Amino acid sequence: TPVGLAGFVNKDQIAKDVKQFYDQALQQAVVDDDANNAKAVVKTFHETLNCCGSSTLSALTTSMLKNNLCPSGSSIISNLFKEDCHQKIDELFSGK
């Protein structure tokens, strides 16, 4: 493959894909079982990006709060008013 013809991953596509993965894990984490690693995945996203939930799936944050799946330490209102995980994922790929 000529160097000039190399493919690459663009910021908009991968941000979109990562948000979809997060949304799927959030949904799976609210319907309860442990065959799914979903609760561990959502907790890890929340702790790593310092967020809890998605503004596209706002009602689901009520289950995150009752299962203690938001970042440890954080208060209830601060999971409500801080930026959501989609915004944090955008900032990761944009370098902000």
How many angstroms separate the CA atoms of 91 and 95, rounded? 6
How many angstroms separate the CA atoms of 68 and 12, rounded? 31
**Solved how?**
X-ray
Calculate ∠ Cα 17-53-27, nearest 5°: 70
How many angstroms separate the CA atoms of 49 and 46, rounded? 6
How many angstroms separate the CA atoms of 14 and 94, rounded? 11
How many angstroms separate the CA atoms of 94 and 11, rounded? 7
Residue 82 to residues 50, 79, 85, 86, Cα–Cα distance (Å): 9, 6, 9, 12
- E strands, the chain, where? none
How many angstroms separate the CA atoms of 85 and 88, rounded? 5
